[PDB]
Design a protein around this ligand. Structure first.
Ligand code: CA
Length: 145
């Protein structure tokens, strides 16, 4: 099993655009904003449960800065095809700062062992797929100054 995650962050129901992120006003940041993330997954094991942890990180100069602003973990089930979409809802996120940018990272970890890593034909490790791209605009929230 070898899969891929793609992510698209959403704020106030606005999806980050492929080349544009999603913008929030300084006042909205101060009030708190509802953040969600849609994970497009492929090559997961059909019908299997995955523990998905998402983090929102401050990003500057192409790196995450400090500990995540928020983290959320929940369980999802993979579609019958092993490909599909899951939506993580972070709730209202506070403390995003004017003029700063934030990025969503996601990691999916199968509840069951599904990967043979030593070659004895027995599954010994979870399938783990992750999307942790600090420069991915589709995962990026930008707060106006
Ligand atoms: Ca093995």
């Amino acid at each position: 099993p070898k899969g891929k995650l793609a992510t698209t962050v959403s704020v106030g129901g606005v999806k980050a655009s492929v080349g544009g992120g999603v913008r929030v006003t300084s006042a909205q940041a101060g009030a708190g904003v509802d953040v969600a993330d849609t994970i497009a997954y492929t090559g997961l094991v059909a019908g299997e449960a995955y523990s998905v942890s998402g983090s929102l990180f401050e990003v500057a100069d192409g790196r995450t800065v400090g500990d995540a602003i928020v983290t959320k973990t929940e369980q999802f089930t993979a579609s019958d095809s092993g490909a599909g979409e899951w939506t993580v809802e972070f709730g209202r996120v506070a403390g995003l700062e004017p003029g700063k940018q934030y990025v969503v990272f996601e990691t999916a970890t199968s509840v069951k062992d599904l990967v043979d890593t030593d070659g004895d034909d027995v599954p010994d490790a979870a399938q783990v797929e992750k999307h942790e791209d600090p420069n991915d605009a589709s995962q990026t929230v930008v707060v106006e100054e």
